[PDB]
Enzyme design. Sequence first.
Site, PDB file in Angstrom:
ATOM      1  N   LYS A 138      12.142   1.825   1.874  1.00 34.52           N
ATOM      2  CA  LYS A 138      12.875   2.604   2.885  1.00 34.52           C
ATOM      3  C   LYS A 138      12.562   4.095   2.826  1.00 34.52           C
ATOM      4  CE  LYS A 138      16.848  -0.456   3.507  1.00 34.52           C
ATOM      5  NZ  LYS A 138      18.332  -0.456   3.681  1.00 34.52           N
ATOM      6  N   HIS A 186       6.137   6.522 -17.530  1.00 35.85           N
ATOM      7  CA  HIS A 186       7.588   6.370 -17.445  1.00 35.85           C
ATOM      8  C   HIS A 186       8.230   6.424 -18.826  1.00 35.85           C
ATOM      9  CE1 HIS A 186       7.351   5.249 -13.254  1.00 35.85           C
ATOM     10  NE2 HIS A 186       6.840   4.052 -13.485  1.00 35.85           N
ATOM     11  N   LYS A 196      11.035   4.400 -10.129  1.00 36.60           N
ATOM     12  CA  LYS A 196      11.609   4.402  -8.775  1.00 36.60           C
ATOM     13  C   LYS A 196      12.185   5.745  -8.350  1.00 36.60           C
ATOM     14  CE  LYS A 196      10.460   1.307  -7.477  1.00 36.60           C
ATOM     15  NZ  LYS A 196       8.973   1.199  -7.255  1.00 36.60           N
ATOM     16  N   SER A 232      16.582   0.759  -5.588  1.00 33.77           N
ATOM     17  CA  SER A 232      15.133   0.694  -5.492  1.00 33.77           C
ATOM     18  C   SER A 232      14.549  -0.220  -6.570  1.00 33.77           C
ATOM     19  CB  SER A 232      14.553   2.098  -5.616  1.00 33.77           C
ATOM     20  OG  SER A 232      13.142   2.070  -5.467  1.00 33.77           O
ATOM     21  N   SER A 254       6.237   8.161   6.324  1.00 33.53           N
ATOM     22  CA  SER A 254       5.665   7.427   7.450  1.00 33.53           C
ATOM     23  C   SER A 254       4.144   7.276   7.310  1.00 33.53           C
ATOM     24  CB  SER A 254       6.059   8.065   8.785  1.00 33.53           C
ATOM     25  OG  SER A 254       5.493   9.342   8.926  1.00 33.53           O
ATOM     26  N   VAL A 255       3.475   8.288   6.756  1.00 36.87           N
ATOM     27  CA  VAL A 255       2.028   8.187   6.514  1.00 36.87           C
ATOM     28  C   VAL A 255       1.715   7.339   5.279  1.00 36.87           C
ATOM     29  CG1 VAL A 255      -0.089   9.495   5.912  1.00 36.87           C
ATOM     30  CG2 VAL A 255       1.485  10.348   7.708  1.00 36.87           C
ATOM     31  N   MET A 256       2.407   7.615   4.174  1.00 40.10           N
ATOM     32  CA  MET A 256       2.138   6.890   2.933  1.00 40.10           C
ATOM     33  C   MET A 256       2.425   5.398   3.024  1.00 40.10           C
ATOM     34  SD  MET A 256       3.063   9.534  -0.147  1.00 40.10           S
ATOM     35  CE  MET A 256       2.572   8.296  -1.361  1.00 40.10           C
ATOM     36  N   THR A 291       5.091   7.754  -7.119  1.00 41.14           N
ATOM     37  CA  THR A 291       3.947   7.579  -6.228  1.00 41.14           C
ATOM     38  C   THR A 291       3.878   8.748  -5.249  1.00 41.14           C
ATOM     39  OG1 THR A 291       4.328   5.188  -6.422  1.00 41.14           O
ATOM     40  CG2 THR A 291       2.777   5.930  -4.706  1.00 41.14           C
ATOM     41  N   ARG A 295      15.810  11.203  -9.715  1.00 42.40           N
ATOM     42  CA  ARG A 295      16.427  10.742  -8.474  1.00 42.40           C
ATOM     43  C   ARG A 295      17.823  10.256  -8.830  1.00 42.40           C
ATOM     44  NH1 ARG A 295      14.019   5.751  -4.741  1.00 42.40           N
ATOM     45  NH2 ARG A 295      15.043   6.308  -2.782  1.00 42.40           N
TER      46      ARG A 295
HETATM   47  N1  LIG Z   1       6.315   9.776   0.681  1.00 45.80           N
HETATM   48  C1  LIG Z   1       7.525   9.288   0.321  1.00 45.80           C
HETATM   49  N2  LIG Z   1       8.682   9.813   0.775  1.00 45.80           N
HETATM   50  C2  LIG Z   1       9.880   9.321   0.415  1.00 45.80           C
HETATM   51  N3  LIG Z   1      10.005   8.274  -0.412  1.00 45.80           N
HETATM   52  C3  LIG Z   1       8.889   7.682  -0.906  1.00 45.80           C
HETATM   53  C4  LIG Z   1       7.617   8.133  -0.583  1.00 45.80           C
HETATM   54  N4  LIG Z   1       6.708   7.366  -1.208  1.00 45.80           N
HETATM   55  C5  LIG Z   1       7.411   6.447  -1.897  1.00 45.80           C
HETATM   56  N5  LIG Z   1       8.728   6.632  -1.703  1.00 45.80           N
HETATM   57  C6  LIG Z   1       9.852   5.874  -2.291  1.00 45.80           C
HETATM   58  O1  LIG Z   1       9.859   6.087  -3.707  1.00 45.80           O
HETATM   59  C7  LIG Z   1      10.379   4.916  -4.360  1.00 45.80           C
HETATM   60  C8  LIG Z   1       9.346   4.405  -5.355  1.00 45.80           C
HETATM   61  O2  LIG Z   1       9.297   5.302  -6.454  1.00 45.80           O
HETATM   62  P1  LIG Z   1       8.178   5.144  -7.595  1.00 45.80           P
HETATM   63  O3  LIG Z   1       6.918   5.643  -6.931  1.00 45.80           O
HETATM   64  O4  LIG Z   1       8.690   6.050  -8.685  1.00 45.80           O
HETATM   65  O5  LIG Z   1       8.177   3.687  -7.980  1.00 45.80           O
HETATM   66  C9  LIG Z   1      10.665   3.898  -3.256  1.00 45.80           C
HETATM   67  O6  LIG Z   1      12.030   4.108  -2.874  1.00 45.80           O
HETATM   68  P2  LIG Z   1      12.921   2.991  -2.096  1.00 45.80           P
HETATM   69  O7  LIG Z   1      12.728   1.667  -2.796  1.00 45.80           O
HETATM   70  O8  LIG Z   1      14.307   3.565  -2.192  1.00 45.80           O
HETATM   71  O9  LIG Z   1      12.389   2.968  -0.674  1.00 45.80           O
HETATM   72  C10 LIG Z   1       9.683   4.366  -2.195  1.00 45.80           C
HETATM   73  O10 LIG Z   1       9.911   3.877  -0.863  1.00 45.80           O
HETATM   74  O1  LIG Z   2       3.855  -3.543 -11.903  1.00 44.17           O
HETATM   75  N1  LIG Z   2       4.776  -3.001 -12.505  1.00 44.17           N
HETATM   76  O2  LIG Z   2       5.476  -3.680 -13.252  1.00 44.17           O
HETATM   77  C1  LIG Z   2       5.020  -1.671 -12.345  1.00 44.17           C
HETATM   78  C2  LIG Z   2       4.210  -0.928 -11.486  1.00 44.17           C
HETATM   79  C3  LIG Z   2       4.452   0.425 -11.302  1.00 44.17           C
HETATM   80  C4  LIG Z   2       5.508   1.037 -11.969  1.00 44.17           C
HETATM   81  O3  LIG Z   2       5.710   2.359 -11.775  1.00 44.17           O
HETATM   82  C5  LIG Z   2       6.328   0.306 -12.836  1.00 44.17           C
HETATM   83  C6  LIG Z   2       6.080  -1.056 -13.024  1.00 44.17           C
END
Ligand SMILES: Nc1ncnc2c1ncn2[C@@H]1O[C@H](COP(=O)(O)O)[C@@H](OP(=O)(O)O)[C@H]1O
Ligand SMILES: O=[N+]([O-])c1ccc(O)cc1
Length: 289
Positions: A254, A104, A44, A134, A226-228, A48, A126
Amino acid sequence: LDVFRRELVDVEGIPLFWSIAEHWSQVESFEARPDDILISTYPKSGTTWVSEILDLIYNNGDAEKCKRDAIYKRVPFMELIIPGITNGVEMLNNMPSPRIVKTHLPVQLLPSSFWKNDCKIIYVARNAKDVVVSYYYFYQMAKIHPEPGTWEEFLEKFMAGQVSFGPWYDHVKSWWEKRKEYRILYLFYEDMKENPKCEIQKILKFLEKDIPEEILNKILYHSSFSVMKENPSANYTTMMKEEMDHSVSPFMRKGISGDWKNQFTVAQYEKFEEDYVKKMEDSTLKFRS
Ligand SMILES: Nc1ncnc2c1ncn2[C@@H]1O[C@H](COP(=O)(O)O)[C@@H](OP(=O)(O)O)[C@H]1O
Ligand SMILES: O=[N+]([O-])c1ccc(O)cc1
Ligand SMILES: O=[N+]([O-])c1ccc(O)cc1
């Protein structure tokens, strides 16, 4: 398939999904390659986001090329093996170089081949309070996890490190220490929020890539929240409802810094901070919330 909501299983001191533990020898023996780029994060923390940035860089900002498949197939989650569903190790074994690899794993559990191959690693951290919020909502939607319980129960489990991939504190600290031994670009989600261009430029320099301003701007545009959030190749909406239920909480939830203020009570905040200071005073790491 009956693979969801199980209790975590200890692997070398760390709570991991049962099916990762079951297939641990396959993860431990993973064969890295010298030109692999490893994206390493505590869950989190921007995995991504940074994975999409990397794939965009590798494809010169070409949005259609980056929609060739879902992010979880373009950038395999190495250790994630679930019978009948996915095998990150096999996906990577069958992927042509140059590979982008997601993990991870705490540093002590990373397959030794990454060290032996001296791979470049991008680590993203983070702030802990935003991570736990998150992670709470993610636990609810992503059914491979055990039931999170209430927010207060989950917060306590997070503070105790009794969550998937173990304690955030040790994860970020040990990866930070590791930057003195291997080439690790250690980035912060909050910096990417504040000045994404600057952070992508750091990634490019680390990768020894020099690209036109126009391509940099393409990568910036397509990696914004906003795009992703609306991109089905990046927003996890191609998962089955049984695996990730978007209606519970979207993966792209968010995408801000400071959501912790909406979730923590003042008392929870004060308690979390007292605990945090004790755990983090041994480290030169500094975060913004
Ligand atoms: N392009 C982007 N800009 C900002 N935050 C992003 C993002 N893409 C994903 N996130 C945020 O990254 C977190 C997911 O992280 P991971 O990819 O490590 O699981 C989520 O946070 P929130 O749940 O706080 O919205 C997600 O909304
Ligand atoms: O599905 N899952 O349990 C997940 C998927 C993505 C991730 O980064 C961690 C756990
Ligand atoms: O099935 N799942 O929940 C998955 C599968 C693959 C992945 O990378 C993350 C989660």
